[PDB]
Amino acid sequence: SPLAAYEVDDSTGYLTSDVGGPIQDQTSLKAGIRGPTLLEDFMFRQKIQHFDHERVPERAVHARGAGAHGTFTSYADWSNITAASFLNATGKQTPVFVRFSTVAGSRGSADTARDVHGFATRFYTDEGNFDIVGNNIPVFFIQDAIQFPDLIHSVKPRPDNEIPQAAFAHDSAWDFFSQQPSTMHTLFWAMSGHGIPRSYRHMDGFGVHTFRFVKDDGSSKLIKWHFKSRQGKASLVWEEAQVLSGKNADFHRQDLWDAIESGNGPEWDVCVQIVDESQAQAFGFDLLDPTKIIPEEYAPLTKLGLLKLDRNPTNYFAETEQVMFQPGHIVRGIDFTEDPLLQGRLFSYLDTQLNRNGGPNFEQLPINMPRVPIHNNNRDGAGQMFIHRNKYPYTPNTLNSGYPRQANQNAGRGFFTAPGRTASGALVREVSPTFNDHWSQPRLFFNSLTPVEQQFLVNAMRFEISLVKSEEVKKNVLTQLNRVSHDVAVRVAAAIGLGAPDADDTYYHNNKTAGVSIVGSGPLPTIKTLRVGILATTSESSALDQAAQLRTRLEKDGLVVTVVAETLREGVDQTYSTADATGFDGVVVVDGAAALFASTASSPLFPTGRPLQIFVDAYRWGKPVGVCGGKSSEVLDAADVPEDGDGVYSEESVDMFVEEFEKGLATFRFTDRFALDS
Amino acid sequence: SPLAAYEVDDSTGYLTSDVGGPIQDQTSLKAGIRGPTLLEDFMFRQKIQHFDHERVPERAVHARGAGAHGTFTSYADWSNITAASFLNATGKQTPVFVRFSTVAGSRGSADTARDVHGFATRFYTDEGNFDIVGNNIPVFFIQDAIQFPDLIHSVKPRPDNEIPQAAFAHDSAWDFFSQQPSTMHTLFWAMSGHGIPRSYRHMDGFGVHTFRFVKDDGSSKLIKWHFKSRQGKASLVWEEAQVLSGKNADFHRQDLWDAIESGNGPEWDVCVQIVDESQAQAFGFDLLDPTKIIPEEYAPLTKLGLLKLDRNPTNYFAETEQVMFQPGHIVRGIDFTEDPLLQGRLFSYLDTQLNRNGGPNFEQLPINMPRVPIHNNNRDGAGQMFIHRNKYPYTPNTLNSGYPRQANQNAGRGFFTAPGRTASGALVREVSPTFNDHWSQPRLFFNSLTPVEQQFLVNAMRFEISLVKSEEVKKNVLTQLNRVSHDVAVRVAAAIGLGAPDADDTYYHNNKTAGVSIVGSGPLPTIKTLRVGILATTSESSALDQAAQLRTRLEKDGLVVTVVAETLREGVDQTYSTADATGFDGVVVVDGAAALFASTASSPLFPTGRPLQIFVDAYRWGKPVGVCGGKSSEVLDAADVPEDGDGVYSEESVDMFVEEFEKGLATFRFTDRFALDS
Ligand code: HEM
Ligand code: HEM
Ligand SMILES: [Ca+2]
Ligand SMILES: [Ca+2]
Ligand SMILES: [Ca+2]
Ligand SMILES: [Ca+2]
Ligand SMILES: [Ca+2]
């Protein structure tokens, strides 16, 4: 409904050309029944011309993603810190569109690659469109926008053969990281669980840069944007992400679509850290440096409002593929800072839409339109939709009585640059020495992870680095890792055949910061939408009965239940042949199906050992697993799963099973199942 | 070579702009060292503009693919059957470029999706570029080019949410196949192992359409192109293909690249079936219908020459992404037929290149250039790279002395339409009744597969169709399947909880045809490039010695050997953490590593049970597997793998192990390991 005016219905009627002439489109016009096709067949050509031109260039980065519509609602009148109109009253609602994404892969690459992720939000405000073009990691790899193509060429596939897809699994990416140590912070983030989130709904959004909030009186404060998930933070484990990439490349986009269709649209509290202009260098780093966070211990979050996504697109291409974000889409009340990464973005996003749209009128696409009137003297250009009535589109004029009028701080609610901003000094292509500590914050982030989480990050490093051919590059990588943590360097080095360099303690410290760990962020606040696979059998009507019973108990609490069996029928959603543990957040075997549970289990209907392997994989990957009905030994012993294990459940009673199992879903992952380096 | 002149060497020198001005590109120009970026920074803007515009539209279909250069060599002077110059002398060599692809997936989609595959070959002939734009399956889904957008919309992701990336795993695709029964032949091919080829090198190429060979005397014959692999035919198994999609999305592009680098460039015999014009309707179907094969029993293959691919591109984007094939790239000695699918293709490929290139001068890209002089009156257009001297580009002229001269059948070796061709009848948008048997050949194909191959095809259909939500679509699928084979329909129906319709014997028959089965095609003629994984341990110096002695022997037979252990070091190529059975065509455990091979082991260096799961997966997927080093069947017992099994090896002596295992690699798959229906 927000784009309802542009909708085209085809639920009735006869086929027409694009100019409304009724036509057919199923057989070519030929010179005889077995003859050649005629050039005069305009039906053919118009249809095939359209087909032939359907594709547009993918985004230069973040090509793989998915989007949805929603609403933002303000918690207060924030005129005490910003003139921004969308934040000017308690309860004030503004429509939004959000696109989530990975970064490196092309538009058909898997959701569950290890990567940084995008979180781009458009507020269609009553004073113009405002975009916050963020990521799920609060810091960036580089400190100057001019370096963006260097970073992106290095992580994207090698350009002789376009291998590999899979940003971290090759020499060039680690060459760049080891030569450009600014990269360490974001690298450590991407090697954590934040690189493989469980869903777009279980990750946060960050503006990354310091921005300014500007009041109507001209005064300014420095801010960081934080969109804090109300679904909780959660990750995949790496092996699971790898399997999912193959079994369901669409996993994150489907998770989002489904959550919305079920009335479980995801929410975030939109927050800021707010600090004075005089605290630009007060926190031990420079707020212009996008490789640093402000620890929450120095600057707490202020909740500004609620973001909720609750309506899927009607046409993906028209809405999600064509949405064209820009940090240049700014509104009165907000300003830029002199972060050199942000500064250059402002150029990039206006220019790149020429590439994608093929012409200058991209703001006229329905998804890009504002929801207020446009008054300016921009004209013409390919694809111009507007029929402008003002035949004197110049300023200054008298022949249009001086309209449109100039808007500025003092009239017309113009945008204005924060008037306290200044520049001083030589015109330079020099990096500020205040940017030079590339290692302290990576150590702060590492120190804030739990032991098992540190292990997972080491293990991701071990996995990726071991795929680098060049022994020199590997050596250079350990030089940098060792500046963050000697222990990381040692542990990584052990997997890859090299010695770590001697400890260099210049940047070592034991400080920690809250709110960055996933494993430490406690049980999820809600288990609605989480997936429970019930493994049953058609060979015992009792097993189906148990499955049906469990289904109703689980569905009542908003879990999404899949009953698996050998073949489909009423009440069974999925065959063993298609099922996989990656499909579930928890796995329950009904004891009527215990006979299936052997690695022995053979059938033309599924691969040998499949039922058991679903259970075993679930267990190995940390998930809650159990057996419902009272008889658990045969299944559990076949799986080599201990009955007294944490997150392993066995009960006859369905109610008591479900009560226990739902606590395990909230815990989400049983990290005691993963080995630690000693 | 038009490509050698445009190669750019950046191995030395200072950075310049695109107009040769030396510059830097690492720091933006700023007003002071913590200041805003300046608009006058041309270094910044030229770099970022280029980045911002790097991407071009992907191909409308066959977006995912990979290419190589090579040579075609004629085996004879074929002037007795065609005027074509590249085929006019024994030993005549012509440069080629080939791109292979899937069909439905975008860029970045995995190579090992179930799909039809492209095999497009450019012959840079001495009489112009000649393209054969083929597929690895000899028949196409539809019988008229006007239906292409219908087919492609139906198999591409649902356009509200762009889900799913798997072409056959959704309702719309099956809706289309069940409403458009022409699709049955290609559908059966795609559900066979030809949907998941082991590599590009292990599949054939087909022109699909009937074409004409035209002699210099104007006479013509009807032909089908067959490019027959000299590597042998081979497939993946489905579960393996799904895992590979996640573990290595680049699997086929890497396989090809690596084969060429190692001097094992792939080969095909370029063959034709040749039949007289009078046989258009002699074989029980119409040669204008691209849903039908001519059985080899009725028309044998004649070998024309050798295709070999032996040089990789220098820059993927410039060469592989930018190659623009067209069936309109035809040469004297070849002509079209009135196949309504081919007829419309001729329009599409010229038009769609305007989309991809953004302008009309795409034939000037080096990869698209010919190898002979161009003489015509085409002029101007965006991106015009030539400086034409002739200032009277019109015919007829006297001001340029009547040049260029018209070329035709008599003068100048012109292309000419086969002079025997005629048309007669009304101008109609009607399908020929001779196209109406949509079911007999699908059954011929199915009858030709071996029993376990028929099971694989049933199982693929069971898998995909079980993912269709609509019970009606499922019913309608069964209706069509049942017209090809009641048994297929019964066996598919059993997996999806419907009953099959009663037998309809109109199109049933028991005929078979040679050369279409993969499982039946016998051992591979070469094992060069095949991958052997040797699972070892760093714990035991015996294990590493055993792996080295095995390696050195296998490597001499052209096998690619990977030694896997817990960590890298001398002699060890890959860690258990990154290893997968999908990485290998055969797996060996050295008996010194026996202690790793339990469902436990446990280590922070790899996931629990990973060593044994590599071996177990390899066995379940049909691969030759064994233990080298004697007396130990502790490994075979932990894996539940029977020592007496075909393709299971156990030998103390490295030489007897290598002799046996090398036979197993040629056999390739041990299909006794897969269960059949009852
Ligand atoms: C803080 C750093 C950055 C963040 C958080 C970020 C975020 C993102 C996001 C989320 C998208 C996808 C938006 C959508 O979903 O359509 C994107 C696209 C893109 N970004 Fe960035 N970005 C960063 C830095 C850079 C820099 C430094 C440049 C260039 C100098 C750049 C150039 C682009 C380009 C060209 C696109 C494609 C835009 C399109 O086609 O509409 N970004 N960015
Ligand atoms: C016998 C049936 C067909 C075969 C074997 C076939 C084969 C292929 C191949 C191999 C490619 C990829 C070439 C490359 O690697 O760049 C391709 C691309 C394409 N085909 Fe077809 N095709 C068939 C039918 C059709 C039909 C009926 C149409 C349209 C009416 C069509 C339109 C296209 C388009 C638009 C492209 C993209 C070409 C480009 O951007 O360069 N094809 N085809
Ligand atoms: Ca590389
Ligand atoms: Ca984690
Ligand atoms: Ca254009
Ligand atoms: Ca669908
Ligand atoms: Ca002619």
From TrEMBL, chains A, B:
GO MF terms, alphabetically ordered: catalase activity; heme binding; metal ion binding
UniProt entry tagged with the keyword Iron: yes
Record GO biological process: hydrogen peroxide catabolic process; response to oxidative stress
Positions that bind heme d cis-diol 2: R59, R99, F140, Y349, R356
Function as written in the Swiss-Prot or TrEMBL entry: Catalyzes the degradation of hydrogen peroxide (H(2)O(2)) generated by peroxisomal oxidases to water and oxygen, thereby protecting cells from the toxic effects of hydrogen peroxide.
Domain Catalase core residue range list: 16-403
Source species taxonomy: Eukaryota, Fungi, Dikarya, Ascomycota, Pezizomycotina
Binding positions (heme): Y349
PROSITE patterns xrefs: CATALASE_1, CATALASE_2, CATALASE_3
Binding-site residues for heme d cis-diol 1, renumbered to this chain: R59, H62, R99, F148, Y349, Q353, R356
E.C. code: 1.11.1.6
Annotated glycan sites: N511
Obligatory cofactor(s): heme
GO cellular component: cytosol
Pfam families linked to this entry: Catalase, Catalase-rel, Catalase_C
Residue positions binding heme b 1: R59, H62, R99, F148, Y349, Q353, R356
Matching InterPro entries: Catalase, Catalase_AS, Catalase_clade2, Catalase_clade2_helical, Catalase_core, Catalase_haem_BS, Catalase_immune_responsive, Catalase_large_C
Catalytic activity: 2 H2O2 = O2 + 2 H2O
Active site: H62, N135
Organism: Humicola insolens
Protein's recorded name: Catalase
